[PDB]
Amino acid sequence: DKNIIIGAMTALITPFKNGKVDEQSYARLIKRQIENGIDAVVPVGTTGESATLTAEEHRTCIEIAVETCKGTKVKVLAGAGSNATHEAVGLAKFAKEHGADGILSVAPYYNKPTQQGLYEHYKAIAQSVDIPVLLYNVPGRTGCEISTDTIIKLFRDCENIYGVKEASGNIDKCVDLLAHEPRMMLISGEDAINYPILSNGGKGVISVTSNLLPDMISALTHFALDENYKEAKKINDELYNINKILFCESNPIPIKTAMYLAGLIESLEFRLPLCSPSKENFAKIEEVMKKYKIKGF
Amino acid sequence: KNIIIGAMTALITPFKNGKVDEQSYARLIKRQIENGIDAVVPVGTTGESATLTAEEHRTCIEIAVETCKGTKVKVLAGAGSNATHEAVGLAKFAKEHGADGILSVAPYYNKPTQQGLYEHYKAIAQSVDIPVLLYNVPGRTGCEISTDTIIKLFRDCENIYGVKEASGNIDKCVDLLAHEPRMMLISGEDAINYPILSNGGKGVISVTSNLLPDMISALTHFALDENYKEAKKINDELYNINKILFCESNPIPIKTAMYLAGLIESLEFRLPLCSPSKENFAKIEEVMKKYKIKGF
Numbered sequence: 001d002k003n004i005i006i007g008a009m010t011a012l013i014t015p016f017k018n019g020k021v022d023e024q025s026y027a028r029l030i031k032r033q034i035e036n037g038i039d040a041v042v043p044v045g046t047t048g049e050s051a052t053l054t055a056e057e058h059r060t061c062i063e064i065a066v067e068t069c070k071g072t073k074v075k076v077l078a079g080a081g082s083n084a085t086h087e088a089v090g091l092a093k094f095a096k097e098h099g100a101d102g103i104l105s106v107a108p109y110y111n112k113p114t115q116q117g118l119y120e121h122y123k124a125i126a127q128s129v130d131i132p133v134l135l136y137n138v139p140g141r142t143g144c145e146i147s148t149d150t151i152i153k154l155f156r157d158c159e160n161i162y163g164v165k166e167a168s169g170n171i172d173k174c175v176d177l178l179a180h181e182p183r184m185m186l187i188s189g190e191d192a193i194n195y196p197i198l199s200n201g202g203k204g205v206i207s208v209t210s211n212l213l214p215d216m217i218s219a220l221t222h223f224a225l226d227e228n229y230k231e232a233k234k235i236n237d238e239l240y241n242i243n244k245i246l247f248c249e250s251n252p253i254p255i256k257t258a259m260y261l262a263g264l265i266e267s268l269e270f271r272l273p274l275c276s277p278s279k280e281n282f283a284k285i286e287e288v289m290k291k292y293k294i295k296g297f
Numbered sequence: 298k299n300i301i302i303g304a305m306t307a308l309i310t311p312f313k314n315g316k317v318d319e320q321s322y323a324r325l326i327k328r329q330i331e332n333g334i335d336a337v338v339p340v341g342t343t344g345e346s347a348t349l350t351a352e353e354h355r356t357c358i359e360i361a362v363e364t365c366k367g368t369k370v371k372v373l374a375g376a377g378s379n380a381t382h383e384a385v386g387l388a389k390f391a392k393e394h395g396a397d398g399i400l401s402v403a404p405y406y407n408k409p410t411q412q413g414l415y416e417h418y419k420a421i422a423q424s425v426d427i428p429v430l431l432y433n434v435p436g437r438t439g440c441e442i443s444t445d446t447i448i449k450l451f452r453d454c455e456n457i458y459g460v461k462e463a464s465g466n467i468d469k470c471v472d473l474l475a476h477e478p479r480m481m482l483i484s485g486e487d488a489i490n491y492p493i494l495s496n497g498g499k500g501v502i503s504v505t506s507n508l509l510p511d512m513i514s515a516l517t518h519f520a521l522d523e524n525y526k527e528a529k530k531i532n533d534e535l536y537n538i539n540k541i542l543f544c545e546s547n548p549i550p551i552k553t554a555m556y557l558a559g560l561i562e563s564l565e566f567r568l569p570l571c572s573p574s575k576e577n578f579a580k581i582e583e584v585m586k587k588y589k590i591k592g593f
């Protein structure tokens with residue numbers, strides 16, 4: 001009934017070289033995701049350091065994602081959120097214009113809208129495009145929570161709104177959502193609990209770990225969607241150590257560190273206020289990484 | 298260090314037909330000036346900085362500087378960002394337009410580490426030569442500037458002279474001033490204005506003063522005169538309005554109160570902010586009846 005974007009999805013890191021987006025590396029990383037079973041890529045989300053990219057760089061990375069996924073089954077679910085509704089509408093329209101298959105739209109950060117404000121915020125976004133819109137709830141970062149009732153109202157009232165990427169450590173809410181609106185696409189935004197969310201009827205993940213181990217996250221998700229819960233849980237259990245250490249510091253500081261340690265990106269560069277991890281954390285990530293196979297290019 | 302302290306107002310930004318009501322904006326600032334306020338903070342959190350365009354940001358700062366010219370009232374311009382390159386640009390811009398200093402909120406959403414926060418604010422401080430007030434509000438940003446990081450920034454960077462705390466953490470307020478008594482601690486939470494001042498805080502950046510500038514200014518000046526009995530008296534009297542003004546997320550209640558008092562023409566916000574619930578509207582209206590609201 002609704003057009004959806006589900007399955008194993010990757011919140012792409014944005015590699016920097018000499019303070020600019022390494023556009024070749026970016027395309028190479030997306031191709032590596034495609035070749036390891038990923039179903040969709042999320043350019044310029046939180047893991048992609050959307051906050052510190054210019055509007056032009058925002059467009060460059062979405063376009064590279066769109067162009068790299070052409071001729072494949074992999075879709076582009078472009079990050080396009082804002083805590084200003086007029087800007088979120090503009091970003092949604094840009095992402096559509098750029099060939100995105102849908103948008104991921106984070107709940108307004110910092111200004112703490114009410115549930116009524118969130119409803120009007122996302123309705124305005126939904127009314128701006130004709131492509132699928134996935135809500136994104138991460139209260140630890142935004143200071144706000146999209147209630148289950150607000151999500152279900154948006155799902156029922158807006159054709160393009162088809163689900164939510166939950167990063168809230170709240171499996172109760174995941175039960176709440178799918179028990180009252182079983183038609184929505186619940187997407188895990190927290191790698192450590194990928195399997196419990198999938199096993200409750202979630203239909204995908206938007207993963208940080210998949211930057212480093214796309215084949216494992218892909219296999220986990222597809223096992224779960226095929227109702228092979230025993231095989232899905234084993235991979236989820238296997239990934240717990242890496243899933244946790246990748247948040248030793250604020251994402252994407254650890255995942256970019258791991259990608260650099262694996263030789264998958266050429267420079268450990270961030271955009272301030274993000275910075276390199278502590279020495280202690282650098283070493284801890286390297287230690288956890290040694291227990292996993294990291295696919296190359 | 299050059300400082301900006303005393304009674305300060307986080308100015309609301311009135312909208313009329315979807316645009317900044319610049320006449321209303323200037324008129325509200327004059328009312329603040331005539332009511333004993335020492336500085337105004339354009340386009341802070343209470344001013345809906347997040348939903349203003351870059352031009353609206355420039356325009357309200359210009360109106361503030363320019364309206365306070367020839368008065369002793371200073372302009373502490375909101376200029377923070379969660380991208381350091383942008384926060385540097387906003388700081389340089391604010392300096393260029395005659396602001397006396399800047400309020401720079403800790404990066405929201407992307408949760409920098411303490412090292413990143415230090416480098417973030419270090420870059421800002423070195424880009425201008427006007428005072429820089431840190432702004433810690435972890436409930437909104439998802440990050441905390443630790444006491445150690447604030448003190449390091451105060452000691453390492455000339456322009457950084459203090460912090461506006463909106464953290465409900467009087468322990469931290471003791472921590473800050475016991476280890477670095479030279480910094481200017483500024484209250485960002487109206488209900489506890491007096492406890493912060495009585496511990497050596499040197500000012501407030503107030504939401505309530507939009508509605509009751511004379512009372513907040515008088516409270517602050519009593520406290521700075523070490524008339525703690527009178528400062529506390531006002532703080533106690535203001536608790537009810539101070540509390541109801543956060544019934545919903547600021548500035549939803551304060552704009553509701555300004556509208557109810559006849560001080561602004563329309564209860565307009567920019568999405569994702571919206572009108573309060575019918576219930577909250579009525580609660581704000583009821584609490585207000587116990588306070589005397591200065592007109593224009």
Ligand SMILES: [Mg+2]
Nearest residue numbers: 466467468469
């Ligand atoms: Mg305390």
